[PDB]
Write an enzyme that holds these catalytic residues in place. Structure first.
Site, short mmCIF file in Angstrom:
data_model
loop_
_atom_site.label_atom_id
_atom_site.label_comp_id
_atom_site.label_asym_id
_atom_site.label_seq_id
_atom_site.Cartn_x
_atom_site.Cartn_y
_atom_site.Cartn_z
N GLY A 231 0.82 -1.20 0.00
CA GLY A 231 0.00 0.00 0.00
C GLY A 231 0.86 1.26 0.00
CE1 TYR B 105 6.47 -0.52 4.84
CE2 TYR B 105 5.42 0.40 2.89
CZ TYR B 105 5.35 -0.35 4.06
OH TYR B 105 4.17 -0.94 4.44
CG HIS C 140 5.19 2.73 7.12
ND1 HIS C 140 4.58 2.48 5.92
CD2 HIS C 140 4.22 3.17 7.96
CE1 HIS C 140 3.28 2.74 6.02
NE2 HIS C 140 3.04 3.17 7.25
C1 FAD Z 1 -5.32 -6.53 5.75
C2 FAD Z 1 -4.42 -5.60 5.00
C3 FAD Z 1 -3.21 -5.21 5.54
C4 FAD Z 1 -2.38 -4.35 4.83
N1 FAD Z 1 -1.18 -3.99 5.39
C5 FAD Z 1 -0.35 -3.13 4.71
C6 FAD Z 1 0.86 -2.76 5.28
O1 FAD Z 1 1.20 -3.20 6.39
N2 FAD Z 1 1.72 -1.91 4.63
C7 FAD Z 1 1.38 -1.40 3.40
O2 FAD Z 1 2.17 -0.63 2.82
N3 FAD Z 1 0.16 -1.77 2.83
C8 FAD Z 1 -0.72 -2.62 3.48
N4 FAD Z 1 -1.92 -3.01 2.87
C9 FAD Z 1 -1.56 -3.77 1.65
C10 FAD Z 1 -1.93 -3.26 0.28
O3 FAD Z 1 -3.30 -2.99 0.05
C11 FAD Z 1 -1.53 -4.51 -0.45
O4 FAD Z 1 -0.23 -4.82 0.05
C12 FAD Z 1 -1.64 -4.30 -1.94
O5 FAD Z 1 -2.85 -3.61 -2.11
C13 FAD Z 1 -1.84 -5.59 -2.73
O6 FAD Z 1 -2.42 -5.22 -3.96
P1 FAD Z 1 -3.54 -6.08 -4.73
O7 FAD Z 1 -2.93 -7.25 -5.49
O8 FAD Z 1 -4.64 -6.56 -3.83
O9 FAD Z 1 -3.95 -4.94 -5.79
P2 FAD Z 1 -5.40 -4.64 -6.38
O10 FAD Z 1 -6.39 -4.27 -5.30
O11 FAD Z 1 -5.86 -5.84 -7.16
O12 FAD Z 1 -5.11 -3.33 -7.22
C14 FAD Z 1 -3.99 -3.22 -8.06
C15 FAD Z 1 -4.33 -2.29 -9.22
O13 FAD Z 1 -3.94 -2.95 -10.41
C16 FAD Z 1 -5.05 -3.23 -11.22
N5 FAD Z 1 -4.91 -4.54 -11.86
C17 FAD Z 1 -5.47 -5.71 -11.46
N6 FAD Z 1 -5.11 -6.69 -12.33
C18 FAD Z 1 -4.34 -6.15 -13.29
C19 FAD Z 1 -3.72 -6.70 -14.40
N7 FAD Z 1 -4.03 -7.95 -14.77
N8 FAD Z 1 -2.98 -5.89 -15.22
C20 FAD Z 1 -2.86 -4.54 -14.95
N9 FAD Z 1 -3.47 -3.99 -13.84
C21 FAD Z 1 -4.20 -4.79 -13.02
C22 FAD Z 1 -6.24 -3.18 -10.29
O14 FAD Z 1 -7.41 -2.80 -10.96
C23 FAD Z 1 -5.83 -2.10 -9.32
O15 FAD Z 1 -6.09 -0.83 -9.88
C24 FAD Z 1 -2.77 -3.84 3.59
C25 FAD Z 1 -4.00 -4.26 3.05
C26 FAD Z 1 -4.82 -5.12 3.77
C27 FAD Z 1 -6.15 -5.58 3.23
C1 CC2 Z 2 -1.00 -2.04 8.64
C2 CC2 Z 2 -1.22 -1.19 7.43
C3 CC2 Z 2 -0.18 -0.43 6.92
C4 CC2 Z 2 -0.37 0.35 5.80
O1 CC2 Z 2 0.66 1.09 5.30
C5 CC2 Z 2 0.50 1.88 4.21
O2 CC2 Z 2 1.47 2.54 3.80
C6 CC2 Z 2 -0.71 1.93 3.53
C7 CC2 Z 2 -0.83 2.84 2.32
C8 CC2 Z 2 -1.20 4.22 2.83
C9 CC2 Z 2 -1.45 4.38 4.20
C10 CC2 Z 2 -1.80 5.62 4.72
C11 CC2 Z 2 -1.92 6.72 3.85
C12 CC2 Z 2 -1.68 6.57 2.49
C13 CC2 Z 2 -1.80 7.66 1.66
C14 CC2 Z 2 -1.55 7.53 0.30
C15 CC2 Z 2 -1.20 6.29 -0.22
C16 CC2 Z 2 -1.09 5.19 0.61
C17 CC2 Z 2 -1.32 5.33 1.98
C18 CC2 Z 2 -1.78 1.18 4.02
O3 CC2 Z 2 -3.00 1.20 3.43
C19 CC2 Z 2 -1.59 0.39 5.16
C20 CC2 Z 2 -2.63 -0.37 5.66
C21 CC2 Z 2 -2.46 -1.17 6.79
C22 CC2 Z 2 -3.61 -1.99 7.30
#
Ligand code: FAD
Ligand code: CC2
Ligand code: FAD
Ligand code: CC2
EC number: 1.6.5.2
Lengths: 270, 270
Positions: free
Chosen positions: A148, A154, A160
């Protein structure tokens, strides 16, 4: 003609993560790798270690100890068909790709459990032959992670903190520990905020990387030889070794930083 | 009075961990605390993120995205009842204790999944107030961990490497991310080699500490005020701050080591 295993950990065929693994396997195949996948969600996978991981009779059911029983089960061949079929995939592979979204700053729960249930004593690690002396020494592992937050978030000054410490418990604790050589992580930062056209190149670069990936030089971990391996010496670093290091300015590793500077991108760049 | 919640993640009633959870509840009660539990394995907790976490109707079932789908479910009250029950326990709680065996240098998969299902956006963290300004800023958590390896193995010289680096993603990333004041981890090394009579001591030492837990001094984390809290600025450390640290021997913490030396026991000692 080598052998690749792609372990995914994402519920949606919709996800970029799924694209990443599909891209991974296409590239691999056109270069003649044989490829197998463990799509955990699609597998109805059970991620929880318990006695039920053991086919038959427990050595000591009165006091269940997961480590010893699973090992025994591994030897006598009494493991849940589950685990068995995964363990096979492993021994057969040369390369293992781990594809996942970063969740709470580590691997998804389902992926974690997969380690815990599949990585059984004797089969995957050994108290005697720990780390670079592991059963997987002939194999290479790599993390392909999507995120995300941004690289900036990072980075050393990011809110982070350094992504290298976050990688450490997994790349070293779980991959290197079993013997694996670990290639630089594939890191797809801010994947939710990447323009739709960058996202098409990213998938492409990944595929190019894969074309020659066996030949990359792996991440650096401090060899097991630098350490006295017993409770007598404390599994500590040899005096001769701790000595050559008195005047080196950088630690060896993130984990072995020694109160000194962590070598830039130790867990991210070879 | 004050309220505690003890989350446990071990399968056996016979384990030192279960024992430890008992002692805490016991000691904590004898002070006037109201104690609530989540014995994850006993509750048969479901640890896997999925659309089944939302009872309602998906805003966008075609391309399902957990973060936004779950956060919306949160606001409207369409979260699955088992997740909801967990969250009510957290609201009520002043102190939260995590008792578990270290598994593969982290948290048991069932605990990981508990974080992933229960720490839902806006309930447990705010993107607009990450870390020290987070929802749980008014509470205090502590990790209670037991290990196979000896403390020596986890010292700056130990084969496993600095335990502070290992504690980092969990203490900063999971706990502190939510606002939690993180207290020193209760570290019990190689409990499976600890003389029977020794284990009693540990047990009672644990009860002794809990007598005055709420007044402890919390681990140190870089206050979010050091950073420019927006994406345009990359969530980078403030310019003024960056300069007034250029001439400081040690980094701020394990994650904000700034490429310098980590302060001793930053994730282990206040
Ligand atoms: C429980 C949870 C915890 C998280 N913790 C963190 C964290 O600790 N730190 C952090 O930084 N983030 C965090 N996020 C994580 C972040 O959301 C995921 O790490 C990341 O979103 C994974 O992406 P995805 O595959 O689900 O992408 P998607 O949701 O599928 O999105 C990716 C993009 O690419 C597009 N796409 C899909 N398929 C294709 C394709 N075939 N070709 C071209 N484009 C495509 C999609 O439409 C979308 O626009 C967290 C999210 C959750 C739910
Ligand atoms: C444990 C955790 C960590 C995360 O770290 C992140 O950097 C992001 C992405 C993010 C977090 C906060 C503000 C943002 C603003 C712009 C783009 C991404 C942003 C997460 O959505 C996120 C979600 C969870 C659950
Ligand atoms: C999958 C897995 C991964 C692991 N990964 C790691 C790792 O990465 N790094 C690492 O260092 N270690 C690792 N170990 C961690 C280690 O196994 C646990 O930290 C340790 O086993 C926790 O002990 P326990 O409470 O589960 O077991 P127990 O053996 O039950 O611990 C309790 C001991 O005290 C006795 N006892 C029970 N109750 C009491 C009581 N009331 N009073 C006094 N004594 C009592 C028991 O008989 C036993 O001897 C791993 C283990 C497993 C299964
Ligand atoms: C991922 C993992 C890491 C581990 O680290 C450890 O230090 C120990 C304890 C240990 C490891 C190696 C040799 C020992 C020798 C005596 C006592 C404990 C010993 C583990 O049993 C252990 C088990 C797993 C699955």
């Amino acid at each position: 003609g080598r052998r690749a295993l792609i372990v995914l950990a994402h519920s949606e065929r919709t996800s970029f993560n799924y694209a990443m693994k599909e891209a991974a396997a296409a590239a691999l195949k056109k270069k003649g790798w044989e490829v197998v996948e463990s799509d955990l969600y699609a597998m109805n996978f059970n991620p929880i270690i318990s006695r039920k991981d053991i086919t038959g009779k427990l050595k000591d059911p009165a006091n269940f100890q997961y480590p010893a029983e699973s090992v025994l089960a591994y030897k006598e061949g009494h493991l849940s068909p589950d685990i068995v079929a995964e363990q096979k995939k492993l021994e057969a592979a040369d390369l293992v790709i781990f594809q996942f979204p970063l969740q709470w700053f580590g691997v998804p729960a389902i992926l974690k459990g997969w380690f815990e249930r599949v990585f059984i004593g004797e089969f995957a690690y050994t108290y005697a032959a720990m780390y670079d002396k592991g059963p997987f020494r002939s194999k290479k592992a790599v993390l392909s992670i999507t995120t995300g937050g941004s690289g900036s978030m990072y980075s050393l000054q990011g809110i982070h903190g350094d992504m290298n410490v976050i990688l450490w418990p997994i790349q070293s604790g779980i991959l290197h520990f079993c013997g694996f050589q670990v290639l630089e992580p594939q890191l797809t930062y801010s994947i939710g905020h990447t323009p739709a056209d960058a996202r098409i190149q990213i998938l492409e670069g990944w595929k190019k990387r894969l074309e020659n990936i066996w030949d990359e030089t792996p991440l650096y971990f401090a060899p097991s030889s630098l350490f006295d391996l017993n409770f007598q010496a404390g599994f500590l670093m040899k005096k001769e070794v701790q000595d050559e290091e008195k005047n080196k300015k950088f630690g060896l590793s993130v984990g072995h930083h020694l109160g000194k500077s962590i070598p830039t991108d130790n867990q991210i760049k070879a």
